[PDB]
Write a protein that binds this ligand. Structure first.
Ligand SMILES: [Zn+2]
Lengths: 53, 161, 239, 691, 84, 586, 226
């Protein structure tokens, strides 16, 4: 999981297929789109967009 | 009320309200319901002025109607066309003679204009108007019967002092 | 290490055999410590004499009624349970109550042996009818506390011996409570109100003194472990 | 963290706070996976404000979409796809807990799914189109921190979720013994911790900063904001949890924030709790606490407040801050510095001077009494009037910081302001009677009493319980999850060992291999909707390890015998005893106590003013007037409506009579009537009084 | 009848006092007027004006005038004429 | 009494404290005393403790739905920041100690202090003015205490054993002190049946006639077959009260308290309720009531009911597919089937739980809760409501003990959100009706003793019925009680029972029933002929005091408040703006 | 008959600081109350010594850090609260702790004056880096129970002193149980076994003797009735 991750045995029986996404992504991605950051451009073009604005 | 006398309709209303409240587990004594209902049969509608000056179909206090039909009439208790009316909570509370209390929950301008044109005076008998004036309410300890109580020591006890 | 200030003990006499004691002001939290211990000591640490068994003449198997007396055997047992007896024997003794003819028979009719004293002669025992007779023997011995009926399950060689619960303790009913009080502008101190009812044998003051002495002797054992050690003292009241 | 990811339904172009009743604030069947349907404010904004779910990201267009697992031919595959609500209405999605085969095929025939209308139905295994990513796909971050959430009622879950955001940071935090898997992530994503940027070795550690040397030779230095005031007054500070020479990987937590331990959120404390009524001191949701919590600072917190005052130019001159103050002794200002500001580190109570300040007065015109009085004393008139900043009533603490801005040094002060002074006062608030205290399952209560250690019931080994919760309040509120938390917390505190030597018991056949045996003080996780089952917990309760003496305190039923601390007799029946995680809310008594005798009065209405905790007055509504009239309490109503409000003439007479010992005079006529009379006369109405 | 000893502002019992007045309101006015008289007697004028006599019962250490008036009423040491 | 924090009391009583300080030479003048108080010097607290004595203070908890929301208490200084409130008055204030706050007001004038001391004192407001039913009575834990104390359980230690041949009676005690001694030794149980010779408790009427037909007095010993707990409980009641010897259910406690208020002075009632509170707390501390999942028992019959009703639902679905049902009727049939299933599961749970289980013991004793909550906790949640307001045909099988699944929890959240939104809008119409009622009845007051009217209304106390044995009418409590007879009760038995002007109380109604008279004429406010307002005789006894109403009583305000206070408890018209008009579905 | 054997007390050691005492015989129903009385006395009224206040060289208040120290002042105070000390004179005495350079600081490094002892030298206080220098003075005086901090507003101390809470109780844990003991002709009397674990300041038997003396002094009131 994470580097530190203090040992905490879990009672879960199911398997997690998808890790929890960045909790603060809603507040950051919108602003990255507003200012057109380079990483935002890479993410948008990789999604299947051409000449994103 | 049309079929039977005024007493019967009051009993019917009390029974209906008490049944409504009791069917849901709420317990209230019948006397409170009776007190609430009594205010709905305090006015008598006057059809024609036979022993008064009240306009046709005008709501008048029962005591005033009785006094007018009893005393001022020279020929004795000449009847004046008038029958009891059931008029509900809203109109019963709205038909008060105290303009000071009426202006509390009615259009203030209309009430004030009607009072000024009529030049009628409000006697401070009640709770709504007295609190506005700052006078102590005419209920409980505030009535003249108890307010004017005079307290002095007994002659024997005073002598013992 | 000295206490904030010395507590005091006072008494008020509700009746001849009942009294209420007030101990205060105590350090906070000590009211509960003292109360239950004092109550238990008073109830179960004052030796006394009481009837531990009875035998009724003429009846040995049908313990419901006895001829010639208008009181059931249970009523006689309950009456005898209330007898006040003081003794210095340390050995069980036998007392006799014999009466014939109709009328009331009370405790005064008993004839105690040497060393046995009865404090409530007026206590009502039974009422005999015409031709009725009552011949009952009581076993009296000393003990502490309330000992339930010791049965004859393994001692069947004795016939007709009715065991009865014995209230050895001269103290009958004791209650206590703790109340909050303020001293030195702080409202944490405790006042202990202990109400004591006792038999006719001894006054409540003497019973309280005996309980206090017993508790002091008991805690002397703990004190003897290491004397001269740190311990909050109470100091003298007058000087 | 919850605030940042919030979905408001109001503002510019939104809905009014007084509109849309029970029509837009209802839980639509489309919240599932895109908006938490349980956690929402209970105030005016119920339903209008919610929180985004754990697995959700906004579509570039602006539509909240959630992930789902692609299902083809009845086998679940790793082809996660993010769909919107309308995209989901054309498919049939199944639960995440539906059993599946090792390969991935469905083991059952009828599977529970959701239809296009938002209705739950049982369908064939082949009809399944998609599947949820995980059971906790509908709950938010705040709601996912509540263990055994499936056993709590919706209302209680909402209360607990909204209460978890009101926990004040404690002096020493501790992670919960029993929790979910959200404690870690929520701590790291909140940003209240310091995480190493790149792999390296800790160069040095101090209480103020951390230095780390990366594998590339690039140094990194992290400042640790220490004793920093939060917007709401709580102390926010970080302390390092690393030492020199420690290898640290990227993303590792090197420092922890206010409510984090070892990187996990630690909003509260684990306390030994016994479920039983106690002499009525916990009657009506009240809570009894042990004095130990006070002595050992278990529930102590730091509270910092800022007092600001400005000095500006005025038409009579520029008011200056000075150590010298007129008409005041020199002992009160013994703690002031050279320039008239309280020294740092000084202790201040109510009414203490924080910074001296004087203003030009102007016309004096002393009365003859004052003239003679100051002639005998000889103290000549002073042109200035004292206006120094004073500590508000009810507040105390130590000065921990002072900030000064001035136009003399080109600071950007507002127009006309010459200087500005801010003083920070910090205090060490311990737990006390009346402070609210609650768990994570909506169980809340004020502290009715704090018994000494010896009084509290204690276990046979001599351990005194830390808290007592009334039994009557649990079953009614329908929040049985707290009992499960208590049992599992006890199981975690004392390690357990299942008799797996002869074969896994029937109840333990589901436990993962790693969970068969654990030592004491272990921390376990019970994820929401995928946590420990009741049977497994019951089985574990019967396998707890002994104590130092070698005996088990809690039997197989989760109950233990308790000795009475006051009488000493053991209680007649065993009671439930365990460990519960409880947290201190911000609703403290010190901030919720008010009182008035005489103070400021309104300028227009001449009534006492309110809205502030210093000298705010209480409102006497019309319903209270009705109650007084029903009582027949004529005199009390008059005295309360005139003497104590907008009766300027009689108010001073009442004060004088009270101070002089004279009997109170009869009330006059309130201003509310004279003003009304004058106004109604102003409208050309000849209103007159007569006898 | 055989009630336990009242304590606080319950002494004397309200039921016994009520029997000595027309109603609760009359008793309230009775007690208030008597308390005003006691307070005026304490303050008086310095000249020893006897327009209002002092407490006919023995006062306590710091008993309030109202409590003294209620005790006097319970002791049948006063009388009043209703203002009807 | 009530506990008032030190700082709050000082702030409220500042001027009095300043006067006292100046009087005691602690301060030279007003300004010095003011400075001393504001600085809070040590001398202030000594003066405050004395000035506050015998000074009533009003406590209020808004909203003030009825006059008992404001009550006077005698304050006592306590360190801290929280006001200590008596546990009994909570129901009157409708407050719980989980964050609620109270407002404190200080009377100043002598009239106001007398008003608070007499009229508004809490000890004088035990009964509810609405109906006269006692309002300051044991609640929750206390009810669990007094109940547990008075329960009788077979097989208890030290149980009384009937005498046989060569076997006398064993469980017989000379006095309650001996029983206490035996219990302290572990030989007897507080709930074990025994025979005890009581000498200070008055025997019941039948036993008193059997044994003391000339009158019982203290010191007359009588043997009572009862439990030690019941004997201790009866020691709390006044010495003149007959022995009860019954299990103290909430209804039984209410009956006992109501009878006590009817016969004895109110001060005795206050003392008795204080004693009952103390005993209830003490015996609930050690009543063994606790919550654990070993105590939450799940009936074994639940699965069979669920399977059978699921089969019935499958049949309903099949018939719907056949076209014999439309959608709405299918949903209605499924809803009825599942409601029947829920009722059956609840009945099975009720018949499965042992009588001594804490969860069912709490509900059965009347302390709190209801069997529906127990079914939800251990049975099945049942049907839940969609946001539109209609029952979802598929119910929730899982119990909260088992743990609701994701979909069940999501569908359950709808009703929770709906109710939490509805709870506030519920009060709007109640307040509207209350303010109508008070406005119309604002100025109805009792102005004179009697109007001297011969009119009234006819009421019926009971009915003979088919068998001829008279059965009480369930409406007599709120109809005939608290009325004044219009005419003498001479219509039956050929002799008087009670003449005109007699107020019909519990003893009066009991005597009337034994006389075989059903119909009686009672004066009513409707038939009063007073010139203004109403008269005391027509109104009847005041439910708050239990005696004839006093002149000047504000009857109108009390009536309006009593009518309006329970308004929120009634069913109310739908709040859904969208949908269809709710008038038809009255 | 009434038994003559009066109660007697025996002791048995379990560890260096835990002892179990057996009192027997006792009358029925007497073990629990006596054990609870002893427990309350031991946990409430056993005098001891504790640190009342501290003064660090470079800090004016407790809401600040010391350069070169990993822990802040509040953490240092919390660690010091765990210190156990013994004192011989009632009046306050001063101890000094001084260290510099890298390394940890333990209670053993504290310098106690004559008549003052520290029983847990291994207790940790703080840790210092190369540029760290820790200097502090501690005031120790005797008392009983728990006493909160004393404000400098009343104590008259100059700015810089940091009062700390004092926990004078040396006892750590106490519990008791009761069993049945046989005396001639009966088998229903109480034997009390009470175990006490105390901090290293004093031995368990010393605490028990102190509690017994306090209880004797308190219960002498009833005996004074004569
Ligand atoms: Zn009438």
């Amino acid at each position: 999981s994470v580097p530190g991750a203090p040992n905490r045995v879990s009672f879960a029986k199911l398997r997690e297929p998808l890790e929890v996404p960045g909790l603060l992504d809603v507040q950051t991605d919108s602003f990255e789109w507003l200012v057109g950051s380079d990483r935002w451009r890479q993410a948008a073009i990789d999604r299947g967009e051409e000449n994103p604005v | 009320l049309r079929v039977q006398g005024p007493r019967e309709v009051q009993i019917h209303l009390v029974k209906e309200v008490q049944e409504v409240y009791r069917a849901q587990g709420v317990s209230i004594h019948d006397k409170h319901i009776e007190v609430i209902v009594r205010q709905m049969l305090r006015r008598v509608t006057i059809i024609d002025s036979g022993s008064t000056e009240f306009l046709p179909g005008s709501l008048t206090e029962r005591a005033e109607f009785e006094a007018e039909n009893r005393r001022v009439v020279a020929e004795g208790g000449e009847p004046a066309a008038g029958r009891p009316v059931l008029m509900g909570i809203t109109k019963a509370s709205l038909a008060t003679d105290s303009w000071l209390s009426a202006a509390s929950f009615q259009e203030t301008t209309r009430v004030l204009t009607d009072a000024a044109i009529n030049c009628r005076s409000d006697k401070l008998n009640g709770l709504k108007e007295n609190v506005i004036i700052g006078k102590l309410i005419p209920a409980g300890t505030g009535i003249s019967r108890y307010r004017n109580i005079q307290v002095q020591p007994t002659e024997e006890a005073r002598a013992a002092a | 290490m000295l206490i904030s200030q010395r507590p005091t003990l006072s008494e008020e006499t509700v009746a001849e055999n009942r009294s209420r004691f007030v101990i205060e002001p105590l350090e906070p939290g000590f009211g509960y410590t003292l109360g239950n211990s004092l109550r238990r000591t008073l109830l179960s640490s004052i030796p006394g004499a009481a009837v531990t068994s009875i035998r009724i003449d003429g009846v040995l198997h049908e313990f419901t009624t006895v001829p010639g007396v208008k009181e059931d055997v249970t009523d006689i047992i309950l009456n005898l349970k209330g007898l006040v007896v003081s003794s210095d024997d340390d050995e069980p003794v036998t007392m006799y109550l014999r009466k014939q003819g109709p009328g009331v028979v009370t405790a005064g009719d008993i004839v105690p042996p040497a060393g046995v004293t009865v404090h409530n002669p007026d206590m009502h025992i039974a009422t005999l009818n015409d031709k009725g007779k009552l011949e009952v023997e009581l076993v009296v011995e000393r003990g502490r506390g309330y000992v339930p009926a010791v049965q004859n399950k393994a001692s069947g060689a004795e016939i007709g011996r009715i065991p009865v619960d014995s209230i050895y303790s001269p103290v009958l009913k004791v209650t206590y409570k703790v109340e909050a009080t303020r001293v030195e502008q702080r409202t944490d101190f405790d006042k202990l109100i202990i109400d004591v009812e006792t038999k006719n044998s001894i006054s409540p003051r003497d019973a309280l003194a005996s309980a206090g002495g017993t508790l002091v002797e008991l805690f002397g054992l703990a004190r003897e472990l290491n004397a001269d050690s740190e311990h909050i003292e109470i100091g003298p009241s007058p000087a | 963290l919850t605030h940042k990811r919030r979905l408001s339904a109001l503002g510019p172009g939104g809905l009014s706070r007084e509109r849309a009743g029970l029509e837009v604030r209802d839980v639509h069947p489309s919240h599932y996976g895109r908006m938490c349907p349980i956690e929402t404010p209970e105030g005016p904004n119920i339903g209008l404000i919610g929180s985004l779910s754990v697995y959700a990201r906004v579509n570039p267009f602006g539509f909240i979409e959630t992930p789902y697992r692609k299902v083809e031919n009845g086998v679940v595959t790793d082809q996660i796809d993010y769909l919107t609500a309308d995209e989901e209405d054309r498919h049939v999605v199944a639960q995440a807990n539906s059993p599946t085969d090792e390969n991935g095929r469905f083991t059952e025939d009828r599977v529970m799914v959701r239809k296009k209308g938002g209705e739950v139905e049982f369908v064939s295994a082949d009809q399944v189109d998609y599947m949820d990513v995980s059971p906790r796909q509908m709950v938010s971050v705040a709601t996912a921190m509540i263990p055994f959430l499936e056993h709590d009622d919706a209302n209680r879950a909402l209360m607990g979720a909204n209460m978890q955001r009101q926990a004040v940071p404690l002096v020493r935090s501790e992670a919960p013994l029993v929790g979910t898997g959200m404690e870690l992530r929520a701590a790291i994503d909140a940003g209240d911790v310091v995480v190493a940027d790149k792999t390296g070795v800790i160069e040095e550690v101090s209480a103020d900063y951390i230095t780390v040397m990366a594998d590339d030779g690039t140094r990194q230095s992290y400042r640790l904001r220490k004793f920093a005031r939060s917007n709401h007054g709580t102390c926010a500070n970080q302390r390092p949890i690393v030492d020199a020479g420690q290898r640290v990987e990227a993303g590792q937590v090197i420092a922890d924030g206010p409510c984090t331990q070892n990187g996990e959120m630690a909003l509260g404390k684990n306390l030994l709790v016994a479920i039983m009524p106690w002499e009525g001191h916990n009657y009506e949701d009240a809570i009894i606490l042990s004095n130990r919590l006070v002595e050992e600072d278990v529930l102590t917190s730091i509270h910092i407040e800022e007092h600001e005052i400005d000095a500006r130019d005025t038409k009579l001159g520029a008011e200056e801050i000075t150590r010298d103050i007129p008409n005041v002794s020199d002992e009160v200002l013994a703690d002031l510095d050279e320039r008239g500001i309280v020294r740092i580190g000084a202790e201040v109570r109510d009414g203490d001077i924080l910074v001296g300040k004087v203003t030009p007065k102007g016309e004096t015109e002393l009365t003859p009494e004052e003239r003679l009085l100051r002639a005998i004393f000889g103290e000549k008139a002073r042109e200035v009037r004292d206006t120094s900043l004073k500590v508000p009533h009810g507040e105390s603490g130590k000065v921990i910081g002072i900030r000064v801005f001035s136009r003399e040094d080109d600071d950007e002060l507002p127009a006309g302001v010459n200087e500005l002074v801010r003083v920070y006062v910090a205090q060490k608030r311990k737990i006390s009677d009346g402070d609210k205290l609650a768990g994570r399952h909506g169980n809340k209560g004020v502290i009715g009493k704090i018994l000494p250690v010896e009084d509290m019931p204690f276990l046979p080994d001599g351990t005194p319980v830390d808290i007592i919760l009334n039994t009557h309040g649990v079953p009614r509120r329908m929040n049985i999850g707290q009992i499960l938390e208590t049992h599992l917390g006890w199981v975690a505190k004392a390690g357990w060992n299942i008799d797996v030597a002869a074969g896994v018991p029937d109840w333990a056949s589901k436990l993962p291999e790693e969970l068969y045996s654990a030592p004491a003080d272990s921390t376990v996780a019970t994820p929401v909707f995928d946590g420990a089952q009741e049977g497994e917990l019951a089985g574990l309760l019967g396998s707890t390890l002994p104590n130092r003496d070698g005996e088990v305190m809690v039997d197989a039923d989760g109950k233990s015998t308790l000795f009475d601390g006051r009488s000493g007799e053991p209680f007649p029946y065993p009671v439930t005893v365990g460990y519960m995680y409880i947290l201190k809310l911000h609703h403290l008594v010190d901030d919720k106590i008010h009182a008035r005798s005489t103070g400021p009065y309104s300028m227009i209405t001449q009534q006492p003013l309110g809205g502030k905790a210093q000298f705010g007055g209480q409102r006497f509504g019309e319903m209270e007037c009705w109650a007084m009239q029903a009582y027949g309490a004529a005199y009390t109503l008059q005295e309360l409506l005139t003497i104590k409000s907008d009766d300027t003439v009689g108010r001073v007479k009442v004060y004088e009579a009270i101070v002089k010992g004279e009997n109170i005079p009869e009330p006059g006529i309130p201003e509310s009537f004279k003003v009304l009379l004058k106004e109604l006369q102003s409208l050309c109405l000849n209103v007159e009084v007569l006898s | 009848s055989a009630y336990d000893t009242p304590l606080g502002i319950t002494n004397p019992p309200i039921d016994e006092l009520l029997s000595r007045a027309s109603s609760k309101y009359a008793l309230v006015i009775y007690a208030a007027k008597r308390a005003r008289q006691i307070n005026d007697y304490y303050n008086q004028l310095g000249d020893g004006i006897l327009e209002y006599v002092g407490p006919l019962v023995e006062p306590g250490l710091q008993e309030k005038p109202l409590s003294i008036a209620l005790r006097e009423i319970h002791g049948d040491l006063l009388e009043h004429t209703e203002g009807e | 009494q009530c506990g008032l924090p030190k700082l709050m009391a000082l702030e409220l009583f500042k001027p009095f404290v300043m006067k006292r300080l100046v009087d005691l030479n602690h301060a030279q003048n007003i300004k010095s005393a003011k400075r001393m108080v504001e600085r809070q010097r040590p001398q202030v607290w000594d003066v405050l403790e004395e000035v506050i004595a015998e000074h009533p203070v009003l406590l209020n908890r808004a909203p003030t739905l009825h006059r008992l929301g404001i009550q006077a208490f005698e304050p006592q200084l306590v360190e801290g920041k929280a006001i200590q409130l008596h546990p009994l008055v909570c129901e009157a204030f409708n407050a719980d100690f989980d964050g609620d706050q109270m407002a404190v007001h200080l009377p100043l004038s002598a009239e106001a202090q007398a008003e608070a001391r007499i009229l508004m004192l809490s000890s004088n407001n035990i009964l509810s003015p609405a109906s006269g039913k006692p309002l300051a009575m044991p609640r929750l834990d206390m009810v669990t205490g007094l109940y547990y104390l008075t329960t009788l359980v077979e097989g208890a230690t030290g149980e009384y054993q009937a005498a046989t041949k060569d076997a006398p009676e064993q469980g017989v005690y000379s006095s309650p002190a001996e029983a206490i001694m035996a219990m302290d030794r572990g030989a007897l149980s507080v709930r074990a049946k025994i025979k005890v010779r009581l000498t200070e408790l008055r025997p019941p009427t039948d036993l008193e006639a059997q044994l003391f037909e000339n009158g019982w007095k203290p010191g007359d010993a009588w043997t009572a077959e009862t439990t030690l707990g019941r004997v201790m409980f009866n020691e709390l009641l006044p010495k003149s009260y007959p022995f009860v010897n019954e299990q103290m259910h909430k209804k039984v406690q209410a009956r006992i308290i109501n009878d006590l208020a009817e016969r004895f002075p109110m001060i005795v009632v206050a003392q008795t309720v204080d004693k009952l509170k103390d005993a209830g707390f003490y015996w609930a501390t050690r009543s063994g009531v606790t919550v654990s999942m070993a105590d939450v028992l799940v009936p074994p019959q639940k699965q069979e009911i669920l399977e059978r009703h699921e089969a019935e639902a499958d049949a309903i679905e099949r018939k719907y597919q056949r076209g014999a049902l439309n959608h709405t009727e299918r949903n209605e049939s499924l809803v009825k089937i599942w409601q029947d299933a829920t009722e059956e599961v609840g009945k099975a749970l009720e018949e499965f739980y042992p009588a001594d289980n804490p969860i069912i013991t709490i509900v059965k004793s009347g302390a709190t809760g209801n069997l529906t909550q127990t079914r939800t906790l251990a049975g099945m949640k049942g049907l839940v409501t969609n946001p539109k307001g209609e029952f979802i045909p598929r119910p929730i099988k899982s119990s909260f003990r088992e743990g609701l699944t994701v979909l069940e929890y999501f569908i359950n959240t709808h009703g929770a959100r709906k109710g939490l939104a509805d709870t506030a809008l519920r009060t709007a119409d109640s307040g509207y009706l209350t303010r109508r009622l008070v406005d119309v009845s604002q100025d109805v007051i009792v102005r004179e003793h009697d109007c001297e009217t011969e009119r009234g209304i006819n009421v019926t106390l009971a009915e003979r019925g088919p068998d001829g044995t008279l059965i009480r009418d369930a409406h007599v409590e709120t109809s005939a009680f608290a009325r004044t007879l219009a005419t003498d009760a001479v219509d039956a038995n050929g002799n008087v029972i009670i003449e005109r002007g007699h107020d019909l109380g519990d003893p009066a109604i009991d005597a009337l029933l034994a006389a075989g008279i059903t119909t009686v004429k009672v004066r009513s406010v409707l038939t009063c002929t007073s010139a203004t307002g109403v008269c005391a005789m027509c109104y009847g006894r005041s439910m708050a005091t239990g005696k004839l109403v006093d002149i000047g009583e504000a009857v109108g305000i009390v009536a309006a408040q009593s009518i309006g206070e329970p308004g929120t408890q009634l069913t109310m018209r739908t709040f859904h703006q969208g949908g269809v008009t709710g008038g038809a579905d009255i």
